[PDB]
Structure formats: C-alpha cells, structure tokens
Amino acid sequence: TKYRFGNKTHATTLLDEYIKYKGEPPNDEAFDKYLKAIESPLVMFSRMLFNW
Amino acid sequence: MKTRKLTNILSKLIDKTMAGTSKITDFTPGSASRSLLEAVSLEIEQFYILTKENIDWGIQEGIIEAFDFQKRQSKRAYGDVTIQFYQPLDMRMYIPAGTTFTSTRQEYPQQFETLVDYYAEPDSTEIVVEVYCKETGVAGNVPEGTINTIASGSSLIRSVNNEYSFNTGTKEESQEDFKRRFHSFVESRGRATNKSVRYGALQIPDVEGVYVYEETGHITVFAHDRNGNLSDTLKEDIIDALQDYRPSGIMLDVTGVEKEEVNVSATVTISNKSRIGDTLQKHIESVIRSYLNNLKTSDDLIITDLIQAIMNIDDVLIYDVSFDNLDENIIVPPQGIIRAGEIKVELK
C-alpha cells in the first residue's frame, strides 16, 4: 500500500526465499527480484467453407 | 546520365533539321512537324526521367541484395479496450477467444481481434482486454472513442469504448531509419570499438535505444525494450550476441536503466475557438505521453523537438505552446530514461 508499487505473489516469493535463507541469501538478486518484477473450430469451419 | 529537358531537345532537333539541307521547312507553332518534334522530345524526356528513377531503384535494390542487411516488417497496432456493463455480473462469464472488435465510422472500418482467453469475474462492472489490429498498417492508430462495436457480445454489455488512441501501428520501415541503421552497420565492421558494441546491441529487434559507457577496462551497456524493461532472457541474449562483438580481454556488464518521472503541465493556444473540445485535449495528452515513450537513453529533455512534434499535428490549428517550469533542458544521466510523466493541458 504505502509505496509506489505493490504485488502480493511477487512479494510473497521474495519472503519465501528470504525466510528459507534465514534473511541472508547467497545473492543480492533476492532484493532485486521484487524491484525488477514490479513496474477455433468455428473459425476454421467458416473459413474452409468459404474457400470451397 | 544528365537530364535533358524538352526545350533543349527541341532546339537541337530544329538545328539538325535546318542544317540537314532543308530551307523550305519551317517550325512555326501549329505545324505538324513542330508537334511531332515536341512529342519526340517529350518521349526522350520521359525516357531520361524513367532512366534516372530506375537508376535510383537499382542502387537501392543492389544495396539490399549486397550483404545480408534488410529492413524489417511493420508492427501490428494494439491497444486496450474498455467494457461497460449495465450491472455488475452475478456469475463468472467466459469470453470466447477470437472475439472481433470493430467500429461503425466509415473512416475506420478496420477490424481487431483478441489473442488470449479472458474471464469476467462476478461483481465486476468493467473489464479491459488487449486487442491486436489484423491489418498491418497505420490504419490501426484510431483516435479516441472509435472502436464502439463487439461481436458475439451478450446483453449484459452496455458500452464499448477505448479510453486512449493506440498510436502504436506503423508502416514499413522508414528509408531514413534504414539508412541510419545501415550506417551503424558499416561503421561497426571494425570490431572492438564503441560503435561495434553499439551495433551488436542494437541488432536485436526487441531492444531499442541502447547506450554505452566506457570506464577503464570496464564496458557497460544500458539496454531496454520499448516498454523500458529488461527481462533476464533478453538480457542474456544481448550478452551472447555481444560476446562475438565484445573486445577481448575487457569487462562487460549490463544493468538495465532507471526511469524518471517529470510533469510537463503543457499549455496550448488554439486558433479555432469552435474546434476546442475535450476530445482534442485527450488527443494532445495522448500524443505528448506517446512522445515521452519510445525515447532513447542519455538524451536531454529537449523542448524544441517536443513543440515541433506537437505542432506537427496541425500547423494552422495549433497556434503556440508554452511551459511553466521545464523551459530549460533537463540533462539525463547515462542510466536515466525519461518515460513516465503526468500531462495536464491548460488551454488559454
């Protein structure tokens, strides 16, 4: 809510990785991730029928 | 060869006829010989003009054939369309794929069609789905409130309207842009240089307006797509492409681009007092916002090009344009791109 960009599933994904790595994951991508992730049968029959 | 006009050929024919042991003949106007001479001269003129046009076409076609450098095809127009129902849906509804959106005005009889499934959940009074213009041309760039028709639509639908003009369709690639990209390719034949990296980054059709910043032993390329984003797959594809073109034994790295938002708050003076209306305001807002997008990295917010672009719509109708705070060009850093921005029109 408070900031420019909000998403549940994206933010969840970060939290699940954060929790698993005990709050210090092996790559800073874990903190990038939320920032870079947030910002015929009827036709065919009618066609062939026209063609014939 | 050199172009010969009618009058010169006619004078030369007259002089050959006079010198050719013929004193009886005269070239007054109304004569049959003068008319035949003029006709022949005009035929030779036509032949020379068509020869020059064929030489130009030949040069273009040989340059196309030479090498493996060719222009790319046109992009289909696309945009958002807004559905208004009489009442919020009581149950979930499914929209059949390939639903056709069209208009009733005779100026824009171009069709549209959806590519993916969509679902109208209950207790929702409106739904927005994306649409792609089936015809490949600039006719898809319809003004606001044009697409007012839906095929296979239920009775629930009350109104169909697009909130914003597309302004995304394009024709075949411009001769000047092709010429410039071909210059880039020619200068990029010598590898291991700024221009070589530039062409190796620009040759991907998705990426648009890249920039290079050369720190000691340390290249960086600031690449973004037409939306201003850089997905990981496309980033890796750019890196792999540049690997062939990258100077050996020197670091390369990429990190997208950081957007910046400025509010122009533009004001425009309109000659015709009758033509002023909300529709024109919305069209000016959409034109300005579109100008703000599709802009490359590391270029100042030049206002002269902005005003020339918005005056391009109508030289006579639009009189003058002025600004309140952004009268001085805003210098953008290497990792800055001016794409966002809220536009308020203040007509005098």
Next chain:
Amino acid sequence: NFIPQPQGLLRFLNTSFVSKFYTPQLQLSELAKKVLTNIKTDDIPVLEREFNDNTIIHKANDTLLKVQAPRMYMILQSIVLEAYAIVNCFVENPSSLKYLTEEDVSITRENLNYVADYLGNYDDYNSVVLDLRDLDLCFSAIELQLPLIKKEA
C-alpha cells in the same frame, strides 16, 4: 453533396527567367473564381486519413520550389485550382460547367508548359514534371472537346 477533400489538398488550395516558347499571363477563369470563393467562405467537409501518397502529398510540398520560387508556386496553385474546377462539375453538380470556355483551358496549358520547362533545369524534382506532362495532354483533350460537350448537353 460534395465528397470531403483531403487535408493536404485543402491546405494547399487555400492560398528573371522566362521561356521563349510559352509564357504565362496569371489569368484565372470565372469557374475557378467561383470555386475559390466557395472554399474560402463555406466550410467544406474534409477527410481525416491521408493514405493516398500521390499528387501534392510529399511532392509539391516536399520540393524547395515553395521557398525558392514563390511566383512559380503561384502557377502550380492556379493549375490545381483549374484542374480541380473542371473535375468538380463533371463528377457532380454539372450546373457550373456553363461558365467554362475554350480560352479558360488554353491559358492553363501555357502556364503548365512554362513551369514545366523551368522544373526541367532541376535534376532532383523531375517527379513533379512526370505528372505535369501527363496532365498537360489531359487539358488539351478538354480544349479540343469542351465546345462539343456543352452543345451536346
């Protein structure tokens, strides 16, 4: 009952060297006068698209004849008005073909030949001449046929 006009054409139509064979006189026809007033006063319908990339579209406005030779640019406008006037009556509202006469088209061709000869010096802008020579023989067929049409109708 008038077909809407392109924005290009509508903007175009609303406003030393000398050749030895043909010369101009800057004379306008009565029929061309009446149309000019109609467009000046009444707000004729106009189109919004510009698909047709021919005629004055990027040819008459693209050339530097507009800035270099404005007098020559006044001949081209007169020919367009005289070309647009004759096309007006025959397609629709034939009541205005009473004011046209032989001398109206005679002077137009002479003006055509002079501007056409002057454009022959320029090697870039031969594209404009390409259409003018085709149009030149179009006026001559009206010139040798207009007196018979009025008596027939």
